[PDB]
Ligand binder design. Structure first.
Ligand SMILES: *[C@@H]1O[C@H](CO)[C@@H](O[C@@H]2O[C@H](CO)[C@@H](O)[C@H](O)[C@H]2NC(C)=O)[C@H](O)[C@H]1NC(C)=O
Ligand SMILES: *[C@@H]1O[C@H](CO)[C@@H](O[C@@H]2O[C@H](CO)[C@@H](O)[C@H](O)[C@H]2NC(C)=O)[C@H](O)[C@H]1NC(C)=O
Ligand SMILES: *[C@@H]1O[C@H](CO)[C@@H](O[C@@H]2O[C@H](CO)[C@@H](O)[C@H](O)[C@H]2NC(C)=O)[C@H](O)[C@H]1NC(C)=O
Ligand SMILES: *[C@@H]1O[C@H](CO)[C@@H](O[C@@H]2O[C@H](CO)[C@@H](O)[C@H](O)[C@H]2NC(C)=O)[C@H](O)[C@H]1NC(C)=O
Ligand SMILES: *[C@@H]1O[C@H](CO)[C@@H](O[C@@H]2O[C@H](CO)[C@@H](O)[C@H](O)[C@H]2NC(C)=O)[C@H](O)[C@H]1NC(C)=O
Ligand SMILES: *[C@@H]1O[C@H](CO)[C@@H](O[C@@H]2O[C@H](CO)[C@@H](O)[C@H](O)[C@H]2NC(C)=O)[C@H](O)[C@H]1NC(C)=O
Ligand SMILES: *[C@@H]1O[C@H](CO)[C@@H](O[C@@H]2O[C@H](CO)[C@@H](O)[C@H](O)[C@H]2NC(C)=O)[C@H](O)[C@H]1NC(C)=O
Ligand SMILES: *[C@@H]1O[C@H](CO)[C@@H](O)[C@H](O)[C@H]1NC(C)=O
Ligand SMILES: *[C@@H]1O[C@H](CO)[C@@H](O)[C@H](O)[C@H]1NC(C)=O
Ligand SMILES: *[C@@H]1O[C@H](CO)[C@@H](O)[C@H](O)[C@H]1NC(C)=O
Ligand SMILES: *[C@@H]1O[C@H](CO)[C@@H](O)[C@H](O)[C@H]1NC(C)=O
Ligand SMILES: *[C@@H]1O[C@H](CO)[C@@H](O)[C@H](O)[C@H]1NC(C)=O
Ligand SMILES: *[C@@H]1O[C@H](CO)[C@@H](O)[C@H](O)[C@H]1NC(C)=O
Ligand SMILES: *[C@@H]1O[C@H](CO)[C@@H](O)[C@H](O)[C@H]1NC(C)=O
Ligand SMILES: *[C@@H]1O[C@H](CO)[C@@H](O)[C@H](O)[C@H]1NC(C)=O
Lengths: 166, 424, 198
């Protein structure tokens, strides 16, 4: 049986006739060693997506890298968050509006260096509620808001015989 | 059995009889809508050709298939974050309720946060979260991305929206929040549904009790009925089945000597191994394309649901709707959002006519030969005396020149009756 | 980046076409991606096998393209239906639907043509300057309860006035802008004041 992974001591109660185990996924996850009858767990070697966080090239060539669902002790301004291990962004305690989303409440922006922060959901405003006070506008403004909606798509066409068997 | 379509009810229609409610109830209806979907992601080369250079090189003969599949899944994940943002992040400022929750008898403790516990969720939200494997899926190159907005942030958005609705009515949705006393806000909502302010104020204690009771009924209904949140659970189940199906496809041979790529590479040399790997690539690629297509269709359905939820958030919570059955069953008064796993629950507070009474009616009254019509309500009779009353609540008043108007004479209106109009 | 919604649609279609065209350079297991080279080099007993491999790969690529276009088209159809609804309700009328025709109280909207799309300029009324006032649900004059017909009762701290809800415009409280229902013993928060009868 061949493969790549990390071997750990298992706590599975293998029956005397069982030589290996499988997970819910029906992939091998445990093996009995052929020389000593020890049960080992097999986990895959650490992997995950790699995402690059960047301001545009019009502003800076500095980037930050997110190792998605990976611990910061496995990868080799290193910040461990729920989304993964973020390297190159300085973690700050000041919240701001979300610029570049990272995940799990964490956003990043370029402010110079790239920083990561828990995003703000807006300014707080306690309303002065009471049982006998009403606010009434004494003036007003006229606002014009722009809403952009797609209506149509380019009308392509493909000749199936021309494309496949030109 | 042949199913029934409902109880029969013959309405007692006649040309001169009108029913007018003499009482009412406050109803809270629960509407549950999906907002987001689990943000899965699959590495196409990892799934098809895990840890194998030979398979990956063979996979390069199929061009950009993996790139467009990864792009499609990335687009779905981005769409799910957009859906969540559009439904919940509709308020510019984070509003808070005052420390003294004196709302004229209206109790909101079931829908407002209770800071006694680490996550600042309300009790109903706690019910929703409590009512509604990962390693086995993850190990094949199938990761799950966390949502951009955490459950605490969704709770904070619903808290802000709720605090705005309670302390400012609909004003916070159109501009700066303007404070108002909650019975006065209810008076505006009653005017919105065509009921005068005095109906609310005279019965303020009854209305507050009916509202608090209806909220308690929601609490009991959620606490009791197990299948209530089926709309969200079905989405979770469909995604779990889709991932389990995708992972189980790796155990299929697809005509190859073995489903395990490592066994083929361990046993065979390239002239035979490439044939066996090509069979595995074809089957695994077809399975992954099927998965992605199903996720795109399901995501489109979730997007439509999220757009509906955002529309309901804007029209039912940040305003008062005149659209029938859009914001609950009855005449819409107000709605309250609640966070739920991958979704939103709206508690719609509606005015529902209760007690029934028959009255005799007429389109106009003939007084001095002139035809008098009601300005706001209808003319009714209890069999001996004629009164004018608002249409949605029986409240008879003496008919006077201040609540009627004159147009034409008595010879044109069909069904006009003779009576006296007073001129104080 | 203001018109990103339309540019994204253009980019997605351009990428879909570029991906479909680039799939013709793939071998799909054949000896060559070029059909003419296979037919120039091989006789039918071997050429048919190589062509079948190319047909399978190109057909799969074309089916993938069409499926993506159908899903994208459904999304565009939904957007177009929304745009048509906004055209009818925001431009050919005045909407009372909150946040449907812009942020604020909707007054009117103006359509503008855009590449593969529509831009709506929504003209809304937005409350500006704020002022606090003391209020009451009703006023007790002669023992009768007076309620406002159209606005609310407000006080500046010494005098009581009746004003329209969305714009501060105090008027003397009279019998022509209020109505009477019941007495002063039922309304919670009723205040004492004078109602004038011109
Ligand atoms: C209502 O608001 C408008 C602006 O939205 C005010 O008009 C401004 O008044 C100031 C006076 O100090 C001028 O300096 C500005 O140039 C004016 N701007 C415009 C666009 O007219 C208006 O005065 C306000 N009215 C009240 C009663 O407060
Ligand atoms: C209007 O309906 C409410 C119930 O929706 C009535 O309130 C009930 O009145 C009875 C008296 O027979 C009490 O026993 C109940 O405890 C009351 N329930 C609540 C929730 O208050 C109310 O009396 C009705 N009013 C009229 C005029 O018919
Ligand atoms: C607001 O509602 C909550 C529950 O809906 C009330 O809390 C209950 O109070 C009673 C007291 O008679 C207790 O027996 C219950 O155990 C409480 N339940 C919970 C969940 O706390 C609260 O008292 C209400 N507030 C007001 C002012 O009436
Ligand atoms: C229709 O309503 C009128 C108004 O209340 C009723 O007239 C009153 O009837 C009561 C009998 O209980 C008398 O005590 C009052 O003096 C009457 N008032 C007036 C102004 O006449 C009338 O009886 C009602 N008719 C029916 C059939 O219910
Ligand atoms: C309402 O009142 C008028 C009178 O004020 C009624 O008109 C009478 O109709 C009868 C039948 O045609 C005539 O004989 C009388 O001469 C009419 N009266 C006058 C003064 O001309 C009318 O019928 C009444 N309508 C109802 C429905 O009772
Ligand atoms: C509330 O409004 C009334 C009406 O304008 C104010 O009464 C006026 O106050 C001015 C002071 O600048 C006097 O010159 C007028 O003669 C008053 N008019 C009347 C009819 O009394 C009143 O001062 C305002 N109160 C507050 C606290 O602003
Ligand atoms: C509104 O005015 C009435 C009188 O018109 C006030 O009623 C008085 O209340 C006190 C306290 O109970 C009694 O001692 C008086 O005898 C009452 N007056 C009369 C004429 O009976 C009432 O308190 C006023 N309300 C407010 C909020 O000021
Ligand atoms: C060889 O394998 C047998 C299997 O039962 C085991 O008992 C024995 O200890 C092994 N010997 C060594 C030196 O590993
Ligand atoms: C982008 O860079 C160009 C120079 O290449 C500059 O003229 C322009 O102002 C920049 N725009 C922004 C938004 O930084
Ligand atoms: C990363 O590893 C450390 C062990 O050194 C552990 O304490 C920590 O919880 C891990 N973090 C995650 C996110 O797995
Ligand atoms: C945030 O503040 C705490 C103090 O409560 C401190 O321990 C922590 O290091 C700070 N984090 C950052 C990133 O500065
Ligand atoms: C009104 O009259 C009809 C008789 O046609 C009767 O069936 C109905 O119950 C009455 N409604 C009420 C509220 O009494
Ligand atoms: C109303 O209907 C009755 C029949 O039930 C009829 O006798 C009467 O004339 C009608 N009234 C009018 C004004 O048409
Ligand atoms: C109204 O009063 C509150 C005090 O509770 C104050 O914070 C607020 O600024 C006031 N609003 C205006 C417009 O003066
Ligand atoms: C309004 O609230 C205050 C508390 O700030 C209280 O003293 C007063 O009695 C209340 N008025 C009414 C009519 O409930």
């Amino acid at each position: 049986l061949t493969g790549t992974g990390v071997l750990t001591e298992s706590n599975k109660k293998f029956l005397p006739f069982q030589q290996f185990g499988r997970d819910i996924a029906d992939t091998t996850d445990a093996v009995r060693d052929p020389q000593t009858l020890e049960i080992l767990d097999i986990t895959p070697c650490s992997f995950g997506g790699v995402s690059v966080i960047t301001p545009g090239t019009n502003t800076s060539n500095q980037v930050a890298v997110l190792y998605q669902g990976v611990n910061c002790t496995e990868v080799p301004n290193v910040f461990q968050t729920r989304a993964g291990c973020l390297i190159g962004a300085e973690h700050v305690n000041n919240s701001y509006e979300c610029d570049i989303p990272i995940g799990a409440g964490i956003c990043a922006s370029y402010q110079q260096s790239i920083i990561a922060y828990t995003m703000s959901l807006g300014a707080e405003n306690s309303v002065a509620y009471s049982n006998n006070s009403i606010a009434i506008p004494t003036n007003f403004t006229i606002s014009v808001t722009t809403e952009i909606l797609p209506v149509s798509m380019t009308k392509t066409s493909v000749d199936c015989t021309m494309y496949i068997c030109g | 059995y042949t199913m029934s379509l409902g109880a029969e009810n013959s309405v007692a229609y006649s040309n001169n009889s009108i029913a007018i409610p003499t009482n009412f109830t406050i109803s809270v209806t629960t509407e549950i809508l999906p907002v987001s979907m689990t943000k899965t992601s699959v590495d196409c080369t990892m799934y098809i050709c895990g840890d194998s250079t030979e398979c990956s090189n063979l996979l390069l003969q199929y061009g950009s298939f993996c790139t467009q599949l990864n792009r499609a899944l990335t687009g779905i994940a981005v769409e799910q974050d957009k859906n969540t943002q559009e439904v919940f992040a509709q308020v510019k400022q984070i509003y808070k309720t005052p420390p003294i929750k004196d709302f004229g008898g209206f109790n909101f403790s079931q829908i407002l946060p209770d800071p006694s516990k680490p996550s600042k969720r309300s009790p109903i939200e706690d019910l929703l979260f409590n009512k509604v494997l990962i390693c086995a899926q993850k190990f094949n190159g199938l990761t799950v991305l966390p949502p951009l907005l955490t459950d605490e942030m969704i709770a904070q958005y619903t808290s802000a929206l709720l605090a705005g609705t309670i302390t400012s009515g609909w004003t916070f949705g159109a501009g700066p929040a303007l404070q108002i006393p909650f019975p006065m806000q209810m008076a505006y909502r009653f005017n919105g549904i065509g009921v005068t302010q005095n109906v609310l104020y005279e019965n303020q204690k009854l209305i507050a009790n009916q509202f608090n009771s209806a909220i308690g009924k929601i609490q009991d209904s959620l606490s009791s009925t197990p299948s209530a949140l089926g709309k969200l659970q079905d989405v979770v189940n469909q995604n779990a089945q889709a991932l389990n199906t995708l992972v189980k496809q790796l155990s299929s041979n697809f005509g190859a000597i073995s489903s395990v790529l490592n066994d083929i590479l361990s046993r065979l040399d390239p002239p035979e191994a490439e044939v066996q790997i090509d069979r595995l690539i074809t089957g695994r690629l077809q399975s992954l394309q099927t998965y992605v297509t199903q996720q795109l269709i399901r995501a489109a359905e979730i997007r439509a649901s999220a757009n509906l939820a955002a529309t309901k958030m804007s029209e039912c919570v940040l305003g008062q709707s005149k659209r029938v059955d859009f914001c609950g069953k009855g005449y819409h008064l107000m709605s309250f959002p609640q966070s739920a796993p991958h979704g939103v629950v709206f508690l719609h507070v509606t005015y529902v006519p209760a007690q029934e009474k028959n009255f005799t009616t007429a389109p106009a009254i003939c007084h001095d030969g002139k035809a008098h019509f009601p300005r706001e309500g209808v003319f009714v009779s209890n069999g001996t005396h004629w009164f004018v009353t608002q249409r949605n609540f029986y409240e008879p008043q003496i008919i006077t020149t201040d609540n009627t108007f004159v147009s034409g004479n008595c010879d044109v209106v069909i069904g006009i009756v003779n009576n006296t109009v007073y001129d104080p």
